[PDB]
């Protein structure tokens, strides 16, 4: 497959070119917030982002080489991690705030509008702060986002009878290629050999926190749907079902 024959520079270029757009919220800024209305804005936005994500996924080198079944599994597993890493990236330049959309920039006190949400806001903001502390670069961001896509559900490919871990060599080869790409990016930026492995680990450990936030966010979203606070799109309902 071509994805394996891409140079590191080619990988980066492909990922950068695949990036989804930053969408706007429907927020009417002359109107107030309620718990219901804020959850409505956030889930309306997420629904629209999901469509763009699915089409981004197809442009991640190696993803189309997978079966449709595997493609579904990976996205079902990682969708909220992917939305969340994007959010944290967008919010880097806005300390103490989350840039859900250019017309929906919320501080943690606005998170208190929704019961249980400020806890999620705080974790997202802490990650945004880590991104700043690390001076995370766009080329690194796109690598990490593709890693989430390919990695998050790779350990839950279980055989139909026996439920033994299926070997997914191709996915791991592509993951190895993205590792190669990250190292190349860091070397290009003048990081020493030692700094390269140190930063590689710092970046990958972020993904543990992102998983944590995804899990907590999923439970919170599920609570909102189970209390009839907001109606979720059929797509979002199905992405939630895949997990509560």
């Amino acid at each position: 497959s071509l994805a394996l024959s891409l140079t590191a520079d080619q990988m980066v270029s492909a990922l950068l070119d695949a990036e989804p757009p930053i969408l706007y919220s429907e927020y009417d800024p002359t109107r107030p917030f309620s718990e219901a209305s804020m959850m409505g804005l956030l889930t309306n936005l997420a629904d629209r982002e999901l469509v763009h994500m699915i089409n981004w996924a197809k442009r991640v080198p190696g993803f189309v080489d997978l079966t449709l079944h595997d493609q579904v599994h990976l996205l079902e597993c990682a969708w909220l991690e992917i939305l969340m890493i994007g959010l944290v990236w967008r919010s880097m330049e806005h300390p103490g705030k989350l840039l859900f959309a250019p017309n929906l920039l919320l501080d943690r006190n606005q998170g208190k509008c929704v019961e249980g949400m400020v806890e999620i806001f705080d974790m997202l903001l802490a990650t945004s702060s880590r991104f700043r502390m690390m001076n995370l670069q766009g080329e690194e961001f796109v690598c990490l986002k593709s890693i989430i896509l390919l990695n998050s559900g790779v350990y839950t490919f279980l055989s139909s009878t026996l439920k033994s871990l299926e070997e997914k060599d191709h996915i791991h080869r592509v993951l190895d290629k993205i590792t190669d790409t990250l190292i190349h990016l860091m070397a290009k930026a003048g990081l020493t050999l030692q700094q390269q492995h140190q930063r590689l680990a710092q970046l990958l450990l972020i993904l543990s926190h992102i998983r944590h936030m995804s899990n907590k966010g999923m439970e919170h979203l599920y609570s909102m749907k189970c209390k009839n606070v907001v109606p979720l799109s059929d797509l979002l309902l199905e992405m939630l079902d895949a997990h509560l």
Binding site: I54, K58, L68, V72, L75, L235, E238, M239
Partner: peptide
């Protein structure tokens, strides 16, 4: 399944 369809379409 919406995801399945969107991935194919």
């Amino acid at each position: 399944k919406i995801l399945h369809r969107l991935l194919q379409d």
